[PDB]
């Protein structure tokens with residue numbers, strides 16, 4: 069009901085999927101043993117890392133020998149295993165299903181379209197079709213938020229926590245999403261919800277590190 | 283523990299995500315009332331469809347007023363709500379977590395790389411791009427590794443993760459990809475087909491794959 073040892077997270081501070089897990093752990097009041105894994109120095113490619121995770125990604129979680137990757141899988145695991153109740157990720161099938169669709173939306177649509185837009189910019193202009201696709205995803209998110217304070221209902225869930233990382237990022241990059249009225253208010257709302265749980269320490273700090281490339 | 287009337291699925295027979303849902307429903311012994319949704323004709327773009335699903339995607343599920351989209355969320359919902367047991371998606375946090383990683387692998391890695399390789403070929407008449415193939419092949423190597431010492435993707439028993447992943451393997455088989463040298467995938471594929479044959483594997487997955495293959 070609590071881990072026997074600190075849960076290990078192989079991570080980097082600016083990594084968006086790492087930041088999602090880290091904030092989720094803070095809300096759960098789990099103290100993670102953060103292990104800096106420099107993917108630029110091949111630290112994810114040693115015989116040891118590959119044995120743990122042959123897909124060689126961060127974040128990778130190690131909970132008393134149980135290995136897990138995929139940030140959204142880690143988020144839901146931490147709640148299922150160590151939540152004081154199920155508030156962040158309710159067991160009620162229909163409530164859970166809405167959250168799961170939002171998580172699939174995050175991975176398959178929003179985050180992917182975010183990557184396609186900002187990868188060429190942060191590193192090496194905004195391709196028009198990529199800008200169009202990301203804007204389209206924001207429109208959908210805005211609609212998801214109509215009639216509700218959080219993305220999947222009345223309460224903040226793991227879905228809000230991973231989606232907000234992307235919004236923190238584009239905000240730090242100078243992307244203006246205020247015309248999406250629901251997103252604009254949900255963003256302020258969620259920032260305040262996460263304030264006592266390391267939002268500045270984790271998410272803002274991480275976003276500023278990615279922004280330094282601009 | 284059963285839906286009060288048949289669950290509705292807005293779909294098209296060849297659609298990979300629709301096929302994953304349809305086979306999941308068969309294994310759980312739920313009848314779906316299938317509603318053909320013609321993307322070409324903009325049947326997913328009516329004010330009515332958009333009200334139901336603003337993302338205007340298929341599959342879209344209507345369980346007696348409850349609307350859901352995203353194939354993998356639909357799959358897990360059907361087990362959470364209507365499974366006679368949780369064998370397809372166990373409640374044990376560790377076993378559930380592994381399945382969730384495989385589902386995220388399927389969406390964010392395998393299926394995406396499948397789309398990037400095959401979509402230009404099938405629907406734009408563009409040539410096979412070895413760069414995009416390399417990415418897909420890399421993911422097949424990972425899947426082969428996931429199957430080292432397990433009969434199924436998440437462990438000892440078949441799960442929703444096997445069902446959605448098998449759609450992709452069915453498609454590439456129909457397209458003429460020979461993956462027999464990925465021995466774990468090869469054996470797993472024969473195993474999972476056998477598991478799914480009493481649950482409409484031919485009528486759903488094989489039929490769907492051949493329809494996509496006619497574009498080649």
Ligand SMILES: N[C@@H](CCC(=O)N[C@@H](CS)C(=O)NCC(=O)O)C(=O)O
Pocket residue numbers: 083084085107112123124125126127137138139140390
């Ligand atoms: N969908 C994965 C994404 C993980 C991912 O692609 N992480 C990047 C860093 S942001 C990485 O480890 N790249 C190095 C590699 O894949 O070899 C998740 O949410 O955890």
Ligand SMILES: N[C@@H](CCC(=O)N[C@@H](CS)C(=O)NCC(=O)O)C(=O)O
Pocket residue numbers: 176297298299321326337338339340341351352353354
């Ligand atoms: N990630 C979604 C994929 C849904 C999807 O992109 N479906 C396609 C058909 S294969 C579609 O509805 N395209 C038409 C559109 O989005 O407007 C899932 O797993 O359900």
